[PDB]
DNA sequence: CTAGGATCACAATCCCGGTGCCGAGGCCGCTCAATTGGTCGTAGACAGCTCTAGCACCGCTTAAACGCACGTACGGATTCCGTACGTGCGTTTAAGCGGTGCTAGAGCTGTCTACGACCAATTGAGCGGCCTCGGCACCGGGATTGTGATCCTAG
DNA sequence: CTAGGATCACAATCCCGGTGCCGAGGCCGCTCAATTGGTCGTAGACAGCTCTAGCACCGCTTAAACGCACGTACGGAATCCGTACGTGCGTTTAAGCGGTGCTAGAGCTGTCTACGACCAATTGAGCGGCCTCGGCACCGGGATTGTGATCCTAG
C-alpha cells in the first residue's frame, strides 16, 4: 500500500494543527540562541525561561509567516510554497 | 522569599462566579495575569494621553470611559462602559 | 553552523502547522535566514536590556520586553 | 472606636482589588492626580473582560470534556471571537497553538 | 492620425504623478464624504479646514501604499492588471 | 451618494502614483469600500476625542491623534 | 551681584534648549525625578538628528537648484537613506509625495 | 496673544550651521517640529519604561543612552550616543 | 522577399528668460520662564552575605533525522481566442475662486468650592509555605473511519 | 471490452476502562498595605465675554469628468513534457532524561552622602506683531527627447 502524494501531508497538517507542543528541538535551538547572543556580549548566561520564551516567539512567528506564504502561493494558482512567496509575504508585511 | 503581587486570587474568584465546577492550570493563570496587566497598561496609558492633551492633571472616570471606548472594539466597549458605570454608581452610594 | 540545527523536518512541521501542503526544496534556506534575522533582532534588544540592568544573565523578562517593543507581545512568561 | 474596615471593592460590588488598582495608578507615572472614581471604573472594566474570557474558555473546556482551563482553551476562545481577536491581535498565547484551518483548494 | 500604443500614456502618467506632490482627490467631494461619515457618530459637527486637509492627506497616502502592494501582488501572479483579489490579498497579509 | 464623488479618474490617479499600469474595471468599487472603512475608523476616533473635550468642532489635533493611535502617524499638522 | 546668566545650552555647546527639554521632561509624567545629565543628553541627540535630516534635505534642494527646503526635499532625504527610512517607517510626511519607482516588468 | 512654544528657532539655527545659504518653508518647519516632538516622546517614553522596569525613580543619562541604543537603528545610534556623551562631558566640565 | 537599421513626422518634456507677489527672514517690545544661590532629605551607590539556579559532564534509550529509491503529479512552457481595457474626441458638469454676510462656538479670565493629596493609627486582607488527593496523561485493545484497488455488471 | 459502482483489504484514528502521579486548591501564620478620620490647599467647574473662523450663498470661468467608438494585447483556458518533491524502508545519531557536582551571580540588607526637589529673586531669551524684498511659480518660446512608422538596405 502506498498513499498518493498529499494524503499524508494533509494528515500531518491536521495533526500539527490540533497539537500545541513545540516543534523545534530544544538543544539545537538553545545552541543557536547562544551562538547569536555571543556576537553582542561575551560570557552571557541564559535563564531556562528566556530560551523557552525565545523558542515560543520564533515558532509563532514562523507559523504565521508560513500561513501568509501559503496564501501567496494559492493566489499564484500554485500549491507549492517557494522563496518568492516568502519574500512577497515579508515585503507586504513591512518586514 | 518576599511578595510578588498578582491577580490570581481575583481571577479565581471571577472563575468561581462564572464556572463553579471549572478549575484552572498554573499556565492559564499566568496567561490571565499577563492579560490583566497588559489591559491595565493600555487603558491607563490612553487615559494619561487624554488628560495630557487637554492640559488636565487628574485622571477621572471620564478619562477611563473615553479610553475604554477608544480601545475596546464594538460591543465589548458597550458592555464594559455599562459595567464601569454601574460600579461607579454603586460606589458613589456606598 | 548551529543554524543547521534547524533541520529540514522541523521546518516541514512548522509549515504543516501553517497549513502548507507542498514545499519547495529552496524554502529551507530562506526560512533559516528569516529565523536568523528575527532572532538577531530580539536577542540584540534583550541583551541591551540585560546590560542596562548590569546583569550577566538574560532573564525571561528581558525577552518579554524585547518582544513587546517590537510589537510581538508574548503572553505566559510574566507579561 | 472607628468603623469596621469596608473595602472599596465591596462597596462597588467588585471582585477586583480597587485599592490595589488605585495604588498602581498613583505609582505608575500616569498623571499628577488620580480621581476617586478612576480605580473603581478601571477595576470594573478589567473584571468584566476577565469574566468574559474565562466564561468562553470554560465553555471550550466543557466542549472538550475537560474540567480545567489550559492555554489551548484560552487561544480557542480568543481566536473564535471577532472582537476578542481584534483586541488581542498582536498577542501570542504561549502553548496556544493555532486554529484548525485548511485552504479549500488543498482538499482532495 | 497618431495613436500611442496601450501602455505609453499609462507610463507617462505614472512618471508625472510620481514626480508631483499635489493632492489628487477633488477637495469638495472629499469634504462632503467626510461630513456624511461623521454625521453617523455625532450631529451638528463642524470641521476645521486643517482637519479635512489632514484626513485627505492620510487617506491618499494610505491608498497609494495599498495600490503599491496591490501592484506587487499582481506582478507576483504574472499579471500586469490589478484586480479585487490583489487588494484583498494585500489587505489580508497587512492584517487589515 | 457622496462615496461616488471619489470618481474613476481620481482612483486611476492614485493608482498611477502607486506605479500601477493596468487597472481592472472592478477595482473602483473595491477601493471605494476600502476608503470608506478607513475613513469611518479615523473619523470615529477623532469624534471620540472631540466629544471628550466637550467641543463641537473637530480640530486637526483630534485627527492627528486618531491617526497616531492607529499607527499612521502624520507629520505636518502640529504633531 | 551674582554671576551673568549662562544658558545650559551654551555650557553644553548645544543649539537646542536644555532648560526647555528639562521642563518638558519634569512635567511630562515620565518619572518622579530627572537627572541633571538627562536633558543635556536628550538635547544633544535631538540636535544631531535634526542636523542630519536638515543636511540631507539641503543637499536634495541644492541638487534641485532650489534655495528653500520643502516637504518634498525632506521626503526624498528620508526615503533615500535606509536608516532614516527605518526610523520613520510608519510616518507620513504631508505634501511629500513618493519616490519614483516603476517595476521593471512594466517597462516597454 | 496665546504663546505656543516650538522648536523653530533651534531648527533654524542648526540649518544655518549646516547650510548657511539655505532657507526653509513654513510647511517644512512644521514637519521638523513634528519630527522633534515625536522623537522626544519616543526617547522619553523608552527611558521611562527602562527606569520603571528596574524599580528606579530617576531618569539619568544612562536611561537616555539605553533608550537611544534601543530606538535609533544602526550607525544613527553609534553617532547619537557619541554626540550625547560629548555634550555631557562638556557640560560636566562647565 | 525578408529582417534589420536608418530616416522621418510629430507630440511631449526639459530649459531659458521675464514678471510679479506674498511668504520668509529680520527688528522691536516685554514678560515670563529659565538661571543663580542655598537648604533639606532621601534615593541610589557601594560593600558584604546567602543560596539558588545556571553550567558542565556522563550513560542509556530510543525517537527522530539522514539517505536513497521509485514514481506520479504539479510547475511551466507554448498556442490560440475573444473580450475587456486603454486611447482619443466632443459634450456636460461641477470644482475652484473671489467676495459678502452672519453667528456659533472656541478661547480666555475670574471666583470659589469641592475634591484629592498627606499623615497617623489600626487592622485584616493577601502572600509564602505545607499538604493532600483527583484530574489528567498514558497504556492496551478493540471498534470505527477512511483511502486505495480489486471485482462485477450493464452497457 | 469499458466505466462506473460495489465490494474488499487494512492502516490510522478514535474510544473505553484501568493505572498512578504530581500539580491545584485549601489551610495557617504573619506583616504591611489598605482603611478611617481629619486638615489643607488648589484644580477645575461654572459664568461671562470677546472675536474668529466656520457655514451659507452667489456668480463666473474652465478644467475635469463622462460617454462612446475602436482596436489590440493580455488574461485565461487547453495541451504536453519532465523533473522533482512525496512516501517509504533502513541505518545512524544525538535529543532527552536522570543524576551528580561546582560555583557564579542574583537578590537582599545596611550605611552613608550627594544629587535633586523646592524656594526666592532676578533677568534675558523667545514669542507676538509689523514690515520689506527676493525666490519661486507661471507664461511664452524654443531645443530636445522619444514614440510610431515608413523607407532603403544587406543578405
Author numbering:
A (entry chain E): 39 to 133
B (entry chain D), H (entry chain H): 31 to 124
C (entry chain F), F (entry chain B): 24 to 102
D (entry chain C), G (entry chain G): 10 to 117
E (entry chain A): 38 to 133
Lines from the paper:
The nucleosome core is composed of the histone octamer and approximately 150 bp of DNA, which is left-handedly wrapped around it in a symmetrical manner. In the nucleosome, the N-terminal tails of histones project out from the DNA superhelical gyres.
The cryo-EM samples were prepared in the presence of the PL2-6 single-chain antibody variable fragment (scFv), which stabilizes the nucleosome without crosslinking. During transcription in the nucleosome, RNA polymerase II (RNAPII) gradually peels the DNA from the histone octamer and proceeds with major pauses at SHL(-5) and SHL(-1), which are consistently found in genome-wide studies.
